[PDB]
Amino acid sequence: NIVTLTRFVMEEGRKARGTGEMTQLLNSLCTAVKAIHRAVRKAGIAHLYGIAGSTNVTGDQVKKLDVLSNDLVINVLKSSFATCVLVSEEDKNAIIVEPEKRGKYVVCFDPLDGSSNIDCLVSIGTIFGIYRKNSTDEPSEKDALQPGRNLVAAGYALYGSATMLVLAMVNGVNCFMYDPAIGEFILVDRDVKIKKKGSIYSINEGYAKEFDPAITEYIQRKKFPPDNSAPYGARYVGSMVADVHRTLVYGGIFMYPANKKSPKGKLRLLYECNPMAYVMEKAGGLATTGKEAVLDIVPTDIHQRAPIILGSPEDVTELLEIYQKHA
Amino acid sequence: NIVTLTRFVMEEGRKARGTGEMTQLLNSLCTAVKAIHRAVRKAGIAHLYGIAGSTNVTGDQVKKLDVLSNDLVINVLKSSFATCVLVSEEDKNAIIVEPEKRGKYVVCFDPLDGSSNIDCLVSIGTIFGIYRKNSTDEPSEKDALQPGRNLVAAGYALYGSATMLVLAMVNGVNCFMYDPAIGEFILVDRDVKIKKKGSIYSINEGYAKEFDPAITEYIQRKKFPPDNSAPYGARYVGSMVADVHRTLVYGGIFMYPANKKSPKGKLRLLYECNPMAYVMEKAGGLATTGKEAVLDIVPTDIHQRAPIILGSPEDVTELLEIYQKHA
Amino acid sequence: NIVTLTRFVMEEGRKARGTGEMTQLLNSLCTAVKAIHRAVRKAGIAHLYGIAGSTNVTGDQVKKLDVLSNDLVINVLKSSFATCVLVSEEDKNAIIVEPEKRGKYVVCFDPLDGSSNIDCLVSIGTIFGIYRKNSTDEPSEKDALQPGRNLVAAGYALYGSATMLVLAMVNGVNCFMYDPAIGEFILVDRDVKIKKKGSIYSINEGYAKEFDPAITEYIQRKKFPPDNSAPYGARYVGSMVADVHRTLVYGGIFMYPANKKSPKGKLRLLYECNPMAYVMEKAGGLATTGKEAVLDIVPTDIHQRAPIILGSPEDVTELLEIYQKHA
Amino acid sequence: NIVTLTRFVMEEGRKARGTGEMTQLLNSLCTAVKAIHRAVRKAGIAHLYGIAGSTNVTGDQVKKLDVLSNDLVINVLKSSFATCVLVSEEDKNAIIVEPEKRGKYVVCFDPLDGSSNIDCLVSIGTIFGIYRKNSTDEPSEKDALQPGRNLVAAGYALYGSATMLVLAMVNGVNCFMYDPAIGEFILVDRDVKIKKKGSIYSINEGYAKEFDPAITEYIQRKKFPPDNSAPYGARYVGSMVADVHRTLVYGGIFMYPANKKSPKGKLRLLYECNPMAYVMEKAGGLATTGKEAVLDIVPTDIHQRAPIILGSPEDVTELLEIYQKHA
Ligand SMILES: Nc1ncnc2c1ncn2[C@@H]1O[C@H](COP(=O)(O)O)[C@@H](O)[C@H]1O
Numbered sequence A, B, C, D: 001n002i003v004t005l006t007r008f009v010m011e012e013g014r015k016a017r018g019t020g021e022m023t024q025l026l027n028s029l030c031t032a033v034k035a036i037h038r039a040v041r042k043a044g045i046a047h048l049y050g051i052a053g054s055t056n057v058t059g060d061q062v063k064k065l066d067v068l069s070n071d072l073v074i075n076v077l078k079s080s081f082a083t084c085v086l087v088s089e090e091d092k093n094a095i096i097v098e099p100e101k102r103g104k105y106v107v108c109f110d111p112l113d114g115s116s117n118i119d120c121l122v123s124i125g126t127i128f129g130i131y132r133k134n135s136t137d138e139p140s141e142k143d144a145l146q147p148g149r150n151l152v153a154a155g156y157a158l159y160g161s162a163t164m165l166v167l168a169m170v171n172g173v174n175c176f177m178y179d180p181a182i183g184e185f186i187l188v189d190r191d192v193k194i195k196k197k198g199s200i201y202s203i204n205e206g207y208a209k210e211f212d213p214a215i216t217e218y219i220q221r222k223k224f225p226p227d228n229s230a231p232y233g234a235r236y237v238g239s240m241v242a243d244v245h246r247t248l249v250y251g252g253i254f255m256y257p258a259n260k261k262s263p264k265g266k267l268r269l270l271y272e273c274n275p276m277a278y279v280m281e282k283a284g285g286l287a288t289t290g291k292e293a294v295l296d297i298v299p300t301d302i303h304q305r306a307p308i309i310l311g312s313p314e315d316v317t318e319l320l321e322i323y324q325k326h327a
């Protein structure tokens, strides 16, 4: 038997004895993801280059892919009737959903990640994280500032050679391939685990001058293992969804450490760092800042940043050992 | 006026007063790429996961993505009645087209490049090179053993977030964006030129222990620049087509130099290095082994390898100088 | 706010305080419908004409569109875990679902209707009807023989210029357009009603020699109104989903009466006549055999036939009056 | 060997030693049809129902399906640099192409036929006719006023369950099936001929009160055959392209004769009757007004009408005889 994402969500929802609100939320985000998909693969681009004529602009003015993505997400989610607060890397402040549509959930997301990679046609993705609104008082940005450990569900869609949605909840990580022919996500990999140890390290080595001595020591090892083993391969697409997914599937390690110009890392805690740490932990891997677990940070600002190192348990443990040795 | 690859090729072919053969070939390649695109993006995969069960395929039958790609390109090209010799990365020997389907052109291609990125859903592409037959002899491999400078047409398809076909001929390099909604490649950038200088270097640094003194020195310069400039960013997707395109479009530099596991480099000269060299040069960029222009190497083995350094001219020459110096 | 079919079903299911079994059933049938869609619009047909080569057959042997359609339906439904008995115009006997997958519902369907229209590329569709298994004893074909009035839900998908799914349940009829770009059904028409009286009659007049005096009288009227009003237009696609849908949307009347060679009508009670009568009644229209309501017939055989006349209330009432006058 | 319309047109064009102009035109038409197909099948309609909300279109802006079709065909054809005069059903006057984009061909087309079937999702199509300029004069309407027998190429696209492009030139009629998955029309039937005799008649019988004695008599014969044969089946989709195609492929007969509301018939001679007449005759069939071959009528008004009777030869002549007799 074949399992579509829609079917899976409904079962999980049925097992968990949900009132159907969370299920609706995931169906929506699934719908959202499929629309972004289409916009990202450039369907109907021929209209932007005057196939039907009547055209005054080869210009900025039309939505960039990012502004489109954000709107799809915001709208589709609001329309699920399951949210009360949304946070988006694209909006300075949290969106508070009108009372008429207010549901019990909070969502943090990055509508289109790997924007540096958009123009070159590289892989780009969508990252989400969902919390249960704990507080009883009016919804506000503070409902977003819950540590990673409170995630009910988190995941990403990767728009690469093909589209994949990865979804992580309390009992594990599942990969659904997208068949755009029928517009359905198929479960192709179940109860996903990352290998204990990989043979690939990912980090922008252009920052070598800015790295702390640990990162420096670690990278040295991978190239010149003291034990004269085979050196790790390097890979860095420049899009976090692409680099992280490759990590989940092939194993190894991904780094975005603090670097002297980015004393607090670059990636965003709530919609970039959080979801991924959650996926990595539910998959048997680790996610640390170098000195603590991402999931445990008590966030203070919805666009706060954080260093992050995630991936195969042994590969990260090895770097945490270098850090403690750097006392 | 919107331009479609079909119209571009026909137009160019008319200007050149061609007899129609090479146009036919180019339309074929184009048809083939569309086909591969579909497979790559996994449309119809639901039928691999039993959506209709298995009674369907009486057979033992299904295709790896790479094999399907190769059957597509072969059949499609053969079908064009324009080729006589074909070289695929996938076959041990040049393929000699049957007399009935034989045309005067020689096509070297990699039907699906970046295969270590296939199972992670990272970017992949198809790479092609076209020549005119240079003998009156029965067609054989000798006909595919020409130097890059004799190419008539070469380019690639990048199956990334969106799909792009880049085509290079004597008069320059044009990029066509695939609009899957209506099945057409739309000319989106015309008579393309690479930035003289770039800000990104692209190379698998895990082979550090194996690089020659020049690549090593050059690498240091990008991380710790002598002018005390900002360092270059690093990007290495793992897929030659994806990494090379980002280079053409943002500028900078891509490297795959020699290493002990490969002394003569990794990438293939005929269907990998050659075509990308032809695009780079038509785009105002440089393509060297570090000692020679890649396009001037007269091959002697269809699966021969070569070291490749390509990208923006100031960048490649800065490295060529490092070589010239050490020598 | 936009309403996808998936979202609608989940709400209705939520209101009705369902245990989620029926919802899953509709999600499945929705998935089923989307797959048939793709097969019907001939996606990937290029493989049937040797685009990738390797081909021994321009032949029967591969599935006809019908055999594919049936399998998609059967499988997808069984996999919803909500059915215990299925009836399909394509299977002599009812399918009894294995206990491991046995759910509480019964489904009667015609995977691809308008098979006479398949070769000419005319509109073809899918028709379904769902019952609640009433009996407490082992599931068997007798669970299918419930009169139309017991339908929990019924509808059809029309594969025409565009794909539409029409769905009818206790509180009304809703039309969802299919956006194959995102693979979603959008609610574009809500709480649908048929107009009281239309200006189009549909029936195969080739059978004029076989018709009863009522049908004959009625057709006379439409052409030569005694009251010297404008005569009705004629329309008959030859595909029941296409003709019926046009009736729902534009109003008027559709006929498939008994004709001397088909003394019991042609269309099938359970998967052809039933669902449509149900849609028509929930839309304010009528569905009679000429002497009684379709929905009220107590069926005796799962492939039993029945005459049927459906459409605008006044238009049908007019023909029921001719019948009683023909005493 | 699989044949794609792109390859078929190029091949045919080479055989004819054309200069490439007419091929370019044909590729354009083909590109246009793909475009219309997308619109017709409602891909991206979700964006009309606020999937991303409305901030999107700052405008007052959206297109009826018929208008979009007409903008596509015009722009696309213009863009081919092959046309000088265009006649669209949608415009009051012939369109004279600007001197810069002017080619030697004249195109008459109906960009979306069967519009009373549009809102019911029934089959619709595009119909085209191509001529060569017959003067040395400044191009004007006079150039579109040629008899059907001077056509160079004509055909249609049927947007039904699947999409088919049928193309007719001096050497015969070929059908290409659209495979939306990869955007290509595949030649599926070659050098097509209609059955000499058919078993289906197609006509709006609501105009019974208005038909001439011959159409009436012929109609009776199909329902009550004098040889006491089985009666013909009836089929009238309401869309000329859909009804005519079924005719070409199953054989039989299609009629749109004179009625008081139309004395000179309904269908247009230039862009409706002409092209379908050209296909029918190339396919071995007949196309009469009832008094003349349709192809021999020299038009005097681009939007002129004509009665049309077409189909299998034994069928049309049987009716022509009824006419000859009454006369
Ligand atoms: N589809 C689902 N998948 C997993 N857990 C769910 C689902 N629906 C509900 N739950 C669980 O039930 C809680 C609330 O249910 P609800 O009222 O449906 O949102 C969530 O916080 C989850 O723990």
Ligand SMILES: Nc1ncnc2c1ncn2[C@@H]1O[C@H](COP(=O)(O)O)[C@@H](O)[C@H]1O
Pocket: C009, C010, C012, C013, C014, C016, C017, C018, C019, C020, C021, C022, C023, C026, C132, C152, C169
């Ligand atoms: N999605 C739904 N839409 C409409 N009615 C429903 C739905 N789900 C359940 N129901 C009602 O609840 C009954 C059984 O619910 P269930 O156990 O979910 O199948 C059905 O017979 C319907 O009357």
Ligand SMILES: Nc1ncnc2c1ncn2[C@H]1OC(COP(=O)(O)O)[C@@H](O)[C@H]1O
Pocket: B009, B010, B012, B013, B014, B015, B016, B017, B018, B019, B020, B021, B022, B023, B026, B152, B169
């Ligand atoms: N579509 C095209 N684009 C660019 N150069 C072309 C094209 N077609 C032919 N050429 C030429 O490259 C050639 C080979 O010619 P032919 O045998 O006509 O295919 C020269 O004939 C030039 O006309």
Ligand SMILES: Nc1ncnc2c1ncn2[C@H]1OC(COP(=O)(O)O)[C@@H](O)[C@H]1O
Pocket: D009, D010, D012, D013, D014, D015, D016, D017, D018, D019, D020, D021, D022, D023, D026, D152, D169
């Ligand atoms: N693709 C084609 N299919 C059929 N006939 C064609 C085609 N192209 C041109 N013809 C011709 O119809 C003509 C008009 O020629 P041209 O000016 O070359 O477009 C004659 O030249 C024939 O060669």
Ligand SMILES: O=P(O)(O)OC[C@H]1O[C@](O)(CO)[C@@H](O)[C@@H]1O
Pocket: A113, A114, A115, A116, A204, A238, A239, A240, A241, A256, A266, A267, A272, B233
């Ligand atoms: O150029 P840099 O600093 O390596 O940025 C790459 C990172 O930037 C981001 O785009 C920031 O959102 C991530 O997706 C990616 O990991």
Ligand SMILES: O=P(O)(O)OC[C@H]1O[C@](O)(CO)[C@@H](O)[C@@H]1O
Pocket: A233, B113, B114, B115, B116, B204, B238, B239, B240, B241, B266, B267, B272
């Ligand atoms: O791990 P490596 O040696 O960098 O391999 C990367 C290269 O391998 C290939 O997959 C082999 O062609 C190229 O696409 C890519 O540039």
Ligand SMILES: O=P(O)(O)OC[C@H]1O[C@](O)(CO)[C@@H](O)[C@@H]1O
Pocket: C113, C114, C115, C116, C204, C238, C239, C240, C241, C256, C266, C267, C272, D233
């Ligand atoms: O040729 P006939 O008898 O009019 O058949 C048309 C009818 O046949 C069917 O295909 C029978 O299933 C219906 O879809 C349609 O109404």
Ligand SMILES: O=P(O)(O)OC[C@H]1O[C@](O)(CO)[C@@H](O)[C@@H]1O
Pocket: C233, D113, D114, D115, D116, D204, D238, D239, D240, D241, D266, D267, D272
């Ligand atoms: O209702 P009527 O007059 O039969 O109209 C049907 C005809 O009208 C049109 O829509 C007008 O072109 C044709 O496609 C079709 O053949």
Ligand SMILES: [Mg+2]
Pocket: A110, A112, A113, A114, A240, A272
């Ligand atoms: Mg990001």
Ligand SMILES: [Mg+2]
Pocket: B089, B110, B112, B113, B114, B240, B272
């Ligand atoms: Mg390769």
Ligand SMILES: [Mg+2]
Pocket: C110, C112, C113, C114, C240, C272
């Ligand atoms: Mg049927």
Ligand SMILES: [Mg+2]
Pocket: D089, D110, D112, D113, D114, D240, D272
């Ligand atoms: Mg018309």
